Amino acid sequence: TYAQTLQNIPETNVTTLDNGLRVASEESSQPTCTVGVWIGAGSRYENEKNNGAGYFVEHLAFKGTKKRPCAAFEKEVESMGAHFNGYTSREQTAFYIKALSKDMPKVVELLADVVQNCALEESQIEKERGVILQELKEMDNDMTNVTFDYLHATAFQGTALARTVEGTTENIKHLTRADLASYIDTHFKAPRMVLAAAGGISHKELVDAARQHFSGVSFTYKEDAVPILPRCRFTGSEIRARDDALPVAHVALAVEGPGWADPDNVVLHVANAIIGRYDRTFGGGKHLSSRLAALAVEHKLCHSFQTFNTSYSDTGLFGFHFVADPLSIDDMMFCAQGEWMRLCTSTTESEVKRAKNHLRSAMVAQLDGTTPVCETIGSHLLNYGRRISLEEWDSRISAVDARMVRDVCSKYIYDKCPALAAVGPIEQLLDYNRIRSGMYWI
Amino acid sequence: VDKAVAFQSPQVGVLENLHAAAYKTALANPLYCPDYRIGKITSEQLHHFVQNNFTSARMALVGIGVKHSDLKQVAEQFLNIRSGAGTSSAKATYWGGEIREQNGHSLVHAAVVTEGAAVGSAEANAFSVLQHVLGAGPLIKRGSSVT
Amino acid sequence: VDKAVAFQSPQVGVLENLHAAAYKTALANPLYCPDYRIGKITSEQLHHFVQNNFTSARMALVGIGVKHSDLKQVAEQFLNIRSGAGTSSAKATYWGGEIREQNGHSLVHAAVVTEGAAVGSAEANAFSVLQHVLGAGPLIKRGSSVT
Amino acid sequence: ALLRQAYSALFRRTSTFALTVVLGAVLFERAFDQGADAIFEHLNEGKLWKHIKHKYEAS
Structure with missing residues (x-):
């Protein structure tokens, strides 16, 4: 029974290493497991000349280490059935491995090696250069993203956040064994990292292995100092990339967010739960509960749309993104901005109750497996400081009510200048002004 | 759609x-x-x-x-x-054909196989393993499968 | 169109x-x-x-x-x-394939053949005749080909 | 911080906004006329009957 199953979930253990780094884990009766290093690094922490290092690095983090080059490293990992994966976004890089709880320790070693003693054989770089260079030309055709990026690039413009996590085309072309080093150098440091694990592992056993390979001690106090980032200025504006030869069109609209810390992020989510999401394959179709959805069917408004609450350390982007035919863009937008409004004005207790029960399931969902748990933990700590339990989250959610939503949405949505990203055959979206006004009264 | x-x-x-x-x-x-x-x-x-x-x-x-x-x-x-076993599935017979879809793509997907084993079969695990021995699916993001 | x-x-x-x-x-x-x-x-x-x-x-x-x-x-x-014989046609190679278009029609057209003769060849006239011997095309409106 | 305070209690909702214009206009009229009339009369000191009236008024 719910109310109870939430407590039985084993508390997550956290103990920091006297050298800055931290360790956390959730032990379960599972044979398999997952562990990884969640570095608080990103494209935000980059700059004009280096833009793209954290990615170029992410690329060379597996082509060997000094201790054991490409062949052996790869061989060593495949041969034990482990899965070494990882990513790297604007404010969070992460390298993690999936394997039998048996390899628990031996694993850490690997992780540890990669971050610290990464090979960086200059012969492999000139090879990884042409690679990224392709990943761009290929990622350069995923409008859903091309959009979000452009969205960021204007939402923040003239700030670190307005940068692609893949970096410029130039940077990729000229980055050097040098700078690549520098990034890892300056960025991959103990305090700014979290060793996370969940599966059939005892905090003890784990914590130790870390104490064994994560031994690098800090002398001064500066090596203990977590660099605070210069905030990014939000700018109500728009960027329109027109190409009428594009089959469909993408549109992203957003407002400045509150940042990881702020509690309202929860509310904001409950909200997004109400406007939900949709793609032409949802089966509920005209009967769906999200008013925006339904209409999108009753009028063929779009192809897909989604509400998102991206949260960064000190900021965030709140909004929605839809894809649609060149001739329904308008109606669609209209309806969307509309719904948004209703949020601040006539949201009901039924809409919330539903949104809450949806959110609950959505949160629980993010923790389906080991990989998804360490991700959360790697994140929770790094971002929130502590680690929030489903029992906590849940309560924080049960506390929200209609009245509460209308107030928070009103706070971050009502009469605010927003950021707009239009890409494709967008001759119908037109005029910020109009789009602006759609930010009040409804 | x-x-x-x-x-x-x-x-x-x-x-x-x-x-x-x-x-x-x-x-x-x-x-x-x-x-x-x-x-x-x-x-x-x-x-x-x-x-x-x-x-x-x-x-x-x-x-x-x-x-x-x-x-x-x-x-x-x-x-x-x-309450029942309803209709019986027509026993699966093997052909051994070859179909080709010319469609001018930069890429060319192609799969060639033969009658493998069946569920529950003993001769199953063999392939499941011969599979891994041959290599099926990666474990190193953006790498090679030396294994 | x-x-x-x-x-x-x-x-x-x-x-x-x-x-x-x-x-x-x-x-x-x-x-x-x-x-x-x-x-x-x-x-x-x-x-x-x-x-x-x-x-x-x-x-x-x-x-x-x-x-x-x-x-x-x-x-x-x-x-x-x-002048010049311009480009040369890639010599025609034989395959021996079988293509099937399932499309739910009252009728089922089907043709089965094998490599035959060429133009200005030996056996050329053989088939042309074997053809008639087998019957190809009618001469009696709404009739039967007893021949 | 008037501009802030204003944008909050006044120009925010399109309701209180309107409600302000109304009341606001009221005040404007009531006091724009005074000033205007006063100004006008001043520019015509002693020419208007409002001035030279005292010379024939007394029952």
Whole structure:
């Protein structure tokens, strides 16, 4: 029974290493497991000349280490059935491995090696250069993203956040064994990292292995100092990339967010739960509960749309993104901005109750497996400081009510200048002004 | 449409034709309704199909997160129309065909196979393993499979 | 469209696939442009194709109702165009395939053949005759071919 | 911080906004006229009957 199953979930253990780094884990009766290093690094922490290092690095983090080059490293990992994966976004890089709880320790070693003693054989770089260079030309055709990026690039413009996590085309072309080093150098440091694990592992056993390979001690106090980032200025504006030869069109609209810390992020989510999401394959179709959805069917408004609450350390982007035919863009937008409004004005207790029960399931969902748990933990700590339990989250959610939503949405949505990203055959979206006004009264 | 998004991955384009050019029946059929029969299916066809195949003996009410006692009470006092083994699936015969879809793509997906083993079979694990020995699926993001 | 009226006769539906599942090249190609290449042909492609294949040695200016003298004077000072056998047709290789188009029709056209003779060949006339012996085309409106 | 305070209690909702214009206009009229009339009369000191009236008024 719910109310109870939430407590039985084993508390997550956290103990920091006297050298800055931290360790956390959730032990379960599972044979398999997952562990990884969640570095608080990103494209935000980059700059004009280096833009793209954290990615170029992410690329060379597996082509060997000094201790054991490409062949052996790869061989060593495949041969034990482990899965070494990882990513790297604007404010969070992460390298993690999936394997039998048996390899628990031996694993850490690997992780540890990669971050610290990464090979960086200059012969492999000139090879990884042409690679990224392709990943761009290929990622350069995923409008859903091309959009979000452009969205960021204007939402923040003239700030670190307005940068692609893949970096410029130039940077990729000229980055050097040098700078690549520098990034890892300056960025991959103990305090700014979290060793996370969940599966059939005892905090003890784990914590130790870390104490064994994560031994690098800090002398001064500066090596203990977590660099605070210069905030990014939000700018109500728009960027329109027109190409009428594009089959469909993408549109992203957003407002400045509150940042990881702020509690309202929860509310904001409950909200997004109400406007939900949709793609032409949802089966509920005209009967769906999200008013925006339904209409999108009753009028063929779009192809897909989604509400998102991206949260960064000190900021965030709140909004929605839809894809649609060149001739329904308008109606669609209209309806969307509309719904948004209703949020601040006539949201009901039924809409919330539903949104809450949806959110609950959505949160629980993010923790389906080991990989998804360490991700959360790697994140929770790094971002929130502590680690929030489903029992906590849940309560924080049960506390929200209609009245509460209308107030928070009103706070971050009502009469605010927003950021707009239009890409494709967008001759119908037109005029910020109009789009602006759609930010009040409804 | 459902079949339009799907076939967005050629990965599913050869897989349909594979089974086709591999068999002559049952398993030789497509997983996504051929175009010609789009909109020509009947309400009766649905029913008959269900009345014929969705029958107790072929059905299993699995389920996590719950006490077996409940998932039981439901199944019995609640489940009808069943009681039976309904229609029998036409034994899958092997063909050994070869289908080719020329379509001017930068890429060329192609799969060549032979009658492998069957579920439950003993001779199964062999391939499952011969598979891994040959290499199926990666574990190193953006790498090579030296294994 | 041109390809839409044509394929109104399944007669041309199997004939396209026949040659496909009979060969691997040249003659194995379709007489009606595949769908994917519709609209993707270039002005170049046309030209090059013509500059390469429409060359004197492969061309013949036949013609009835006229005196040879005229049809000659024309050909000369007018069809000045270069000679040369232009590009060579890739030798036609035999495959021996089998293509099937399931499409829910009351009728089932089906043609089964084997490599036959060529133009200006030996056995050429054999089949032409074996053909008639087997019966090809009728001569009695709404009748039977007892022959 | 008037501009802030204003944008909050006044120009925010399109309701209180309107409600302000109304009341606001009221005040404007009531006091724009005074000033205007006063100004006008001043520019015509002693020419208007409002001035030279005292010379024939007394029952």
